[PDB]
């Protein structure tokens, strides 16, 4: 067993939640996150904390959740067959942040541990996570700067670390039926246990530190840029599109929902107030309409 | 076949009628705006003519479509239900429709007819019919929704004593968001795979759901589209659509097909709300009238 590994994760996720909203909460300065904690039944809990209606977050989600089961859930199975009667624990933080003003992308980052008891063998466990930018009215500097943080921080752990997991987050968070990237991307990764779990864990925390390295100064950056209600406009028929890719493509919440999770921690990712138009697209030549033609297919940031 | 590509003939025909009339019906409610027509083809055979109305008097985003598509082989998403018939000539027809009104107290409305084909060399050709209606209130009203389940009743009666009961439901089965607990609406008739019964009894049914679409719904616009409402009750509206939205993104079938098989997304997704919202454990007040939606409206289940 690997009870005390677990245990330092657990703490390390803790904090983590902890610090990263103290962090939104200082750029806001209006809004501060509210605690739900919630159990289920024989299964574990979590601690989900949300922000509503502040100077810079709009609705921000952060949460920790540790869960437990008898055996995996049935969506499980097809993935992994072979420990479909495994006593497992997964645990992580989850977090989705959609500011007021379009003028400082949307963000999300996850970090995440899953192991499996095995009758006779040493357990199995594998790390995922990363984080990734949406922006709506993107600019150079902050996308170079989001990939330096995260190439930077891949650096100590493997020359081909950072292409590896920046081409997945590129790959992961498409909408093949639009043919358009949620977002200009960041990192992604899972089944990660190829290093020994003392580097795996390092890393994560790495990527968890990462995030706040990344966004926090692009937030502090734009939150102030002057604004239209035509430029809300857009970010709501953007925020249809991030509405979408979590709805009808993420994994993690297919899983969540499919698999009897908690329904309003998993869905704390969809954007407080979306459009749709039929055939919607943002008028040629504008900056709305330079997000999908040059920021979204760049591909290419450090 | 011969009799099959005459039968399909007539199917499509309805089809595109019933397009026609039900634009008709809704642009007479409206009285402002009008549908606007986008004809489009397929890389692979067909096409369809998609319809969509926008900011009226009365309907504030309204898609009706028709399409006819055909082509050798399935797509490989059809390869898991129907595995045997992968390699078959196909052809796939259909009018597809959600209404979203402006005013809260009109409800949202869907309904879909559809006729699937697939031909076998040496064989008999392989049919079915798909389709129903359904009502989505916001504000919903105790006589609307036994009317709405009236027409239903009534249209199914000829065709057999268990009909409407079988389709009611499997409406109330299909249309149901599991992990909330929660119906998308008040119900109607929801059926698939409909073959039972001769081609020409399955193709006067879908006849008869097709009329009784805007036998059961165009009533109630007129009854409701004036009704006073606030920016509250929009509000709330607007919530109530991040349901509709969730439904049609994670679990309806016709919309992960057409996404997932090179469907034409636009197309697919006009059934879409003009806006939704989402909040945190997001619930109306208790003992309002937005709280007995999904109090009583949404569970009843029994309305006729």
Same mark, same amino acid.
């Given at each position: 067993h690997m009870? @005390?590994?677990?245990? +330092?994760?657990?703490?390390?996720?803790?904090?983590?939640?902890?610090?990263?909203? #103290?962090?939104?909460? +200082? #750029?806001?300065?209006?809004? *501060?996150?509210?605690?739900?904690?919630?159990? =289920?039944?024989?299964?574990?809990?979590?601690?989900?904390?949300?922000?509503?209606?502040? +100077?810079?977050?709009?609705?921000?989600?952060?949460n920790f959740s540790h869960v437990y089961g008898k055996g995996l859930p049935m969506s499980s199975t097809e993935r992994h067959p072979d420990i479909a009667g495994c006593?497992?624990?997964?645990?992580?933080?989850? @977090?989705?942040?959609?500011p007021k003003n379009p003028h400082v992308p949307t963000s999300h980052?996850?970090?995440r541990l899953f192991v499996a008891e095995r009758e006779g063998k040493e357990p199995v466990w594998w790390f995922g996570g990363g984080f990734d930018l949406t922006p709506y009215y993107a600019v150079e500097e902050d996308c170079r700067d989001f990939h330096q943080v995260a190439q930077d921080l891949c650096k100590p752990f493997g020359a081909?670390?950072?292409? =590896?997991?920046?081409?997945?987050?590129? #790959?992961?968070?498409?909408?093949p039926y639009r043919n358009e990237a949620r977002?200009?991307?960041?990192?992604?990764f899972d089944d990660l246990n190829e290093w020994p779990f003392e580097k795996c864990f390092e890393f994560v925390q790495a990527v968890g530190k990462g995030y706040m390295d990344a966004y926090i100064?692009?937030?502090?950056?734009?939150?102030?840029? /002057?604004?239209?209600?035509?430029?809300?406009?857009?970010?709501?028929?953007?925020?249809?599109?991030?509405? #979408?890719?979590? @709805?009808?493509?993420?994994?993690?919440?297919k899983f969540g929902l499919q698999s009897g999770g908690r329904t309003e921690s998993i869905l704390i990712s969809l954007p407080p107030r979306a459009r749709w138009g039929?055939?919607?697209? /943002?008028? /040629?030549? *504008?900056?709305?309409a330079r997000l999908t033609e040059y920021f979204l297919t760049k591909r290419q940031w450090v």
């Open positions: 009870s @005390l590994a677990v245990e +330092a994760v657990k703490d390390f996720l803790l904090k983590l939640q902890d610090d990263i909203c #103290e962090a939104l909460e +200082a #750029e806001d300065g209006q809004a *501060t996150f509210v605690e739900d904690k919630w159990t =289920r039944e024989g299964g574990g809990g979590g601690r989900t904390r949300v922000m509503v209606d502040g +100077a810079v977050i709009e609705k921000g989600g952060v006593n497992f624990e997964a645990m992580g933080v989850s @977090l989705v942040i959609h980052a996850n970090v081909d670390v950072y292409a =590896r997991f920046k081409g997945w987050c590129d #790959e992961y968070f498409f909408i977002g200009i991307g960041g990192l992604f100064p692009i937030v502090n950056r734009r939150k102030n840029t /002057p604004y239209t209600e035509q430029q809300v406009e857009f970010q709501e028929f953007r925020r249809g599109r991030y509405a #979408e890719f979590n @709805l009808v493509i993420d994994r993690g919440t039929y055939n919607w697209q /943002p008028e /040629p030549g *504008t900056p709305e």
